[PDB]
């Protein structure tokens, strides 16, 4: 059978160099035959969502709604969501407004995004912050629905790990009401950790870092890190926003709109097929806008099990049971100086590689640069180095990430693998308690080659 | 000519619209206008969501409306509520309820910009606790299904069991829909605490009444503190005669909520049109992306509203936006009937010439709620102690 | 003994048991499935 | 720390309240005139 899945394009973008794929035809080798129908749409109004969404539905009968904007405003996504209180459609989140997350959301509902959740992402910047060491961190929550289980998520994660953390004080602030009673700024400014954690929208983030820049709010010891939701499209970037935000998102430079789109399609005809082929018994199609008392019993929440383990060329293309990816491909970008979103980080599932940017995060932003290179050797009583513990990967408290750079003498040619360790002793505890007096960061490696001084012939 | 207002009101059937239209003619007759001029325009309650939507943008939105009212479907049924209704306005930044006895809406998140001026089921439970006082209670249970309404009265009957007096004991959680409930019984049962607060629907509270019924744990010393849902309907046949209920004043046919509404929202225009800026709402939804800049103020301005010289009494906002005041009736199912046994004005409790009859047959409350001995000592497994 | 002795000072009954594994307030730090938690130990005296 | 404040140009470039909001004690002396303790005082009001 030949069944109707719709793209919806909203945005100024052609879609003549979009709507154009050529993975048909032949990619039909499922019983069912599915078909593409791109529509576009100039304004975000909610009446023409609305509007094309029962005119379409009714014109054509459709099964796959894949929803795809370029806005960036979530209350539009939860409208998404009252479609499937008429609809109960599977809605794909791909990119735009659709591509921001919501925790809590109804246990009827369809809506899948290819962007995780707060969990995942949250323990992607705990990760982040874990590998630079980054301990005292601060926390900046709205009213998003959604931080109950953002900041039980982070104390119940640091909470759990043998490292030192340490929290500050999770904050709130207001937007209804603008900041004329002086009261955001009597919040941020008890704000002196390192790394500070944003959780709110584009909108919100525009008056928040509009007001920090003008109290002080931006240059080193102040970083701001936000998740996906609060970027959003990489092609839209204002100027109030400060040099150097560390943001994470999905594919996006791999994966383009068709190839996004072109996995939403495998995803909805696969979980559809799969009932097929395994319960061999499908119900009918979508029936029009207002008749949803008689079809209302014909919905199956069976193939909501079809949508938590979904595989797809090998990889691990699956989602999880609140309807975001359990396993997903983020990849981590951070903003420079021509204002530009520009890869630095890939993390893998699990493992994050950090090969586009170099070990030193900042470069030169008024204020100081550099660093100060320590480097010494394992002497006993003095220097104490110890092996990372594998069911870590981290050191803890006052033991400082050694490095080591060795090379693996393969016969004849060598390479160059760098292995980490935990360095402390003596030297660590002076160095680390005039280090913390006279406030200066540094770097601590060991000797492989060369050993203690000595003279060689004549040198 | 004065400028031509329109206000948006969401009600049910024709004679509320009609008392609706009266209401603010009369609102331009008493208050003074001198350079605006009210409109009444209300809809339906439409069977199916999407065409109330565009009856909303093509009656209301389409308009130009400030405020806008909400009441409750007339339906005996509950399938589609109108939760999601009060998420249009929220794209465009104020909706009063009139009827509205579900406590989501009391949530700042989800409802940001909407007010009502009914008490729901929480509120009830601040009744409840000065029945805490009116006896002197100190160990109660409560037993709610586990949904959205059990979460907010157990919220607020923690926020209101704060300082160092009373506390509640052992809270019972229930999947509304099971009939088998005998181990809450037996649970609740062995615990020493008698004080029994229920606050379900019918299907449950019926279950509740069977399986409590036939366990033989309606005599003296059970104390059963409901709401309004369950002496209402099928769950009236079964609920014990004595037992302790509740009943809003003027639950069907709210006329003054409508002409007090009108009044309350008339002097918000009239007053709210004196200062500066005042912008207007969008011309329908057709392309209308941008929000409205005047949100949280015109929902400041309904909720600073004071009205001691009322028809309801005296209407009064809180920090939330709900109705302070609550005007309640205890009563009491006396041979299968409902007697007036009290009433609330909103301060106190006054009590008239009835004398309240209890379950068990008894007459008068003693001093103590529960005593008696059989003490638990537990122990670990220690060779030099035990 | 010292039971008997607290049991004989004040006119009441009582019932000892014996009480099995689960000596450390139960401290929810192994990741199971990933959902939140409750309070049902730390101090260890009101199970039922 | 004993800062110092400037009377020559009113607090619109927000510097007399990021100066004056680093003061935590109980007792905090005044050493200026009268005209300039109304805009200090005034300031200050404002702040809390
Ligand atoms: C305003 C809300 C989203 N808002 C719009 C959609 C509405 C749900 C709805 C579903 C179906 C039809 C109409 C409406 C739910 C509420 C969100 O942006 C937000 C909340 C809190 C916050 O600090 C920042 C942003």
């Given at each position: 059978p030949n069944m109707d899945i719709a793209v919806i394009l909203v945005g100024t973008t052609e879609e003549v160099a979009i709507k154009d794929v050529h993975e048909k035809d032949d990619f039909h080798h499922l019983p069912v035959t599915p078909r593409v129908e791109l529509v576009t749409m100039q304004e975000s109004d909610p009446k023409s969502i609305i509007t094309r969404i029962c005119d379409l539905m009714s014109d054509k009968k459709v099964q796959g709604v894949v929803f795809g904007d370029d806005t960036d405003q979530e209350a539009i996504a939860q409208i998404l969501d009252f479609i499937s209180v008429q609809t109960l459609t599977p809605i794909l989140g791909i990119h735009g407004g659709s591509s921001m997350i919501m925790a809590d959301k109804e246990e009827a509902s369809m809506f899948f995004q290819f962007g995780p959740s707060i969990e995942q992402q949250a323990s992607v910047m705990l990760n982040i912050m874990e590998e630079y060491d980054w301990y005292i961190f601060s926390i900046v929550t709205t009213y998003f629905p959604g931080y109950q289980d953002f900041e039980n998520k982070v104390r119940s994660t640091i909470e759990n790990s043998f490292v030192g953390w340490e929290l500050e004080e999770v904050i709130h602030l207001d937007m209804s009401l603008d900041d004329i009673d002086s009261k955001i700024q009597n919040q941020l400014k008890k704000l002196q950790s390192p790394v500070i954690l944003l959780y709110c929208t584009k909108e919100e983030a525009t008056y928040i870092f509009e007001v920090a820049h003008s109290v002080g709010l931006t240059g080193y010891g102040f970083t701001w890190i936000v998740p996906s939701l609060v970027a959003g499209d990489t092609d839209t970037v204002p100027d109030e926003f400060p040099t150097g935000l560390i943001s994470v998102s999905y594919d996006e430079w791999d994966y383009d709109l068709p190839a996004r789109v072109r996995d939403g399609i495998a995803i909805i005809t696969t979980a559809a097929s799969t009932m097929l082929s395994e319960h061999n018994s499908i119900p009918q199609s979508k029936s029009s806008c207002n008749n949803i008392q008689e079809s209302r019993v014909y919905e199956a929440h069976m193939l909501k099990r079809y949508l938590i383990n979904v595989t797809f060329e090998g990889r691990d293309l699956s989602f999880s049971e609140d309807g975001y990816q359990m396993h997903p491909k983020l990849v981590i970008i951070l903003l420079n100086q021509e204002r530009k979103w520009e890869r630095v980080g890939k993390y893998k599932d699990r493992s994050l590689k950090m090969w586009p940017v170099f070990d030193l995060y900042p470069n030169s932003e008024e204020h100081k640069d550099e660093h100060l290179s320590i480097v010494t050797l394992e002497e006993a009583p003095f220097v104490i180095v110890e092996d990372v513990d594998p069911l870590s990967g981290t050191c803890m408290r006052n033991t400082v990430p050694c490095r080591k750079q060795i090379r693996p003498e393969n016969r004849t040619?060598?390479?160059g693998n760098y292995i980490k360790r935990c360095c402390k002793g003596f030297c660590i505890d002076i160095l680390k308690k005039i280090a913390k007096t006279v406030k200066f960061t540094y770097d601590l490696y060991l000797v492989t080659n060369g050993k203690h001084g000595k003279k060689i012939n004549g040198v | 000519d004065p400028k031509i207002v329109n206000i948006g009101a969401v009600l049910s059937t024709k004679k509320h619209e009609q008392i609706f239209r009266e209401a603010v003619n009369q609102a331009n007759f008493f208050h003074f206008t001198r350079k605006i001029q009210l409109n009444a325009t209300s809809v339906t309650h439409r069977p199916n969501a999407i065409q109330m939507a565009l009856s909303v943008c093509e009656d209301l939105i389409s308009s130009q409306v400030y405020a806008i009212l909400v009441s409750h479907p007339p339906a005996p049924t509950d399938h589609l509520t109108p939760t999601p209704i009060s998420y249009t306005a929220g794209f465009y930044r104020p909706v009063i309820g009139l009827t509205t006895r579900m406590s989501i809406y009391s949530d700042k998140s989800i409802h940001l910009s909407f007010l009502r001026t009914v008490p729901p089921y929480s509120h009830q439970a601040l009744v409840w606790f000065e029945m805490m006082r009116l006896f002197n209670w100190n160990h109660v249970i409560l037993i709610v299904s586990d949904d959205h309404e059990g979460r907010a009265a157990q919220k607020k009957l923690e926020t209101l069991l704060e300082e160092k007096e009373?506390?509640?004991?052992?809270?019972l959680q229930f999947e509304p829909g099971t009939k088998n409930?005998?181990?809450?019984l037996l649970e609740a049962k062995e615990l020493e605490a008698r004080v029994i607060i229920l606050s379900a629907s019918e299907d449950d509270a019926t279950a509740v009444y069977k399986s409590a019924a036939m366990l033989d744990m309606t005599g003296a010393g059970y104390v059963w503190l409901v709401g309004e849902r369950e002496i209402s309907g099928s769950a009236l046949?079964?609920?014990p005669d004595?037992?302790?209920?509740?009943?809003?004043?003027?639950?069907?046919?709210?006329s003054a909520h409508i002409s007090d509404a009108v009044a309350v929202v008339a002097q918000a225009?009239?007053?709210?049109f004196e200062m500066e800026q005042i912008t207007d709402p969008p011309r329908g939804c057709v392309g209308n992306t941008n929000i409205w800049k005047t949100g949280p103020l015109f929902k400041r301005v309904l909720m600073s509203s004071k009205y001691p010289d009322g028809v309801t009494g005296r209407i009064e906002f809180n920090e939330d936006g709900d109705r302070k005041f609550a005007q309640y009736?205890?009563?009491?199912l006396q041979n299968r009937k409902l007697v007036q046994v009290g009433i609330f004005?909103?301060?106190?409790?006054?009590?008239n010439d009835r004398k309240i009859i209890w379950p068990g047959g008894e007459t008068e409350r003693p001093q103590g709620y529960q005593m008696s001995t059989r003490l638990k000592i537990v122990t670990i497994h220690q060779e030099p102690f035990v | 003994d010292l039971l008997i002795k607290l049991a004989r000072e004040m006119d009441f009954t009582y019932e000892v048991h014996l009480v099995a594994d689960g000596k450390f307030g139960t401290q929810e730090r192994v990741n199971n499935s990933n959902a939140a938690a409750w309070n049902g130990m730390m101090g260890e005296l009101l199970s039922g």
């Open positions: 040619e060598e390479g | 009373s506390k509640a004991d052992k809270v409930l005998t181990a809450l046949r079964y609920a004595g037992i302790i209920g509740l009943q809003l004043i003027n639950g069907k046919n709210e225009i009239h007053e709210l009736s205890i009563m009491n004005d909103g301060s106190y409790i006054i009590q | -």
